[PDB]
Amino acid sequence: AWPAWPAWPAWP
Amino acid sequence: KKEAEEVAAHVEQIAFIAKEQGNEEVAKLAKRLAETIKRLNEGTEEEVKRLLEAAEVAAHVLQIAFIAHEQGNEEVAKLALELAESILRLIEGTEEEVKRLLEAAEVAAHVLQIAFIAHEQGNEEVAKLALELAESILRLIEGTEEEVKELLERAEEAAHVLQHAFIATEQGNEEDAKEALRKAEEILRRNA
């Protein structure tokens, strides 16, 4: 489908 | 019901880190989000999981605001604070519109992360377009148009075109990146 979104930032 | 515990633990870790760094806004919002996760642990199972996904999106938005405030530009930070406030405000139970606004909110979070990454990499045209689009999506979600579904679909299409332009810039292909930027700008400006 759509190009994948950038991954979520690292959990603090 | 075990996913809620993981999400709440992550949100509380975010609140701890924000208190350590001195970001009081993110700390207050993380506390509000933790309380919201607490008060929504029991209820209808089909909606609790969707609200947990919304809480995950809100925690990611808080992370984005925190890193934006720590690493310079306050535009992304303030926009992400407003987005987290909007998510927490809509979680309160207007389902028929929330099931539609949550996708737009997650797309807005993705666009905010796009803007932050592009600004950190000097690609300031993509960052400007992403900030403009995030403002558009925020004003649509907070707005009372009730014609917001079509405009949000248009904005999400523009956001995916912006993501295509971002990937083109990251790979190093400017020829397609500029065209995708033009197309996204046209799609966004067609909302007036």
Residue numbers in the entry:
A (entry chain G): 11 to 22
B (entry chain H): 6 to 197
Give verbatim lines from the article.
Here, inspired by natural and re-engineered protein–peptide systems, we set out to design proteins made out of repeating units that bind peptides with repeating sequences, with a one-to-one correspondence between the repeat units of the protein and those of the peptide. We use geometric hashing to identify protein backbones and peptide-docking arrangements that are compatible with bidentate hydrogen bonds between the side chains of the protein and the peptide backbone. We design repeat proteins to bind to six different tripeptide-repeat sequences in polyproline II conformations. The proteins are hyperstable and bind to four to six tandem repeats of their tripeptide targets with nanomolar to picomolar affinities in vitro and in living cells.
Reasoning that proline-containing peptides would incur a lower entropic cost upon binding than non-proline-containing peptides, we decided to start our experimental characterization with designs containing at least one proline residue; in most of these designs, the peptide backbone is in or near the polyproline II portion of the Ramachandran map. For the polyproline helix, there are roughly three residues per turn, and, probably because of this, we obtained more designs that target three-residue than two-residue proline-containing repeat units. Crystal structures reveal repeating interactions between protein and peptide interactions as designed, including ladders of hydrogen bonds from protein side chains to peptide backbones. Our results show that by matching superhelical parameters between repeating-protein and repeating-peptide conformations, and incorporating specific hydrogen-bonding and hydrophobic interactions between matched protein and peptide repeats, we can now design modular proteins that bind to extended peptides with high affinity and specificity.
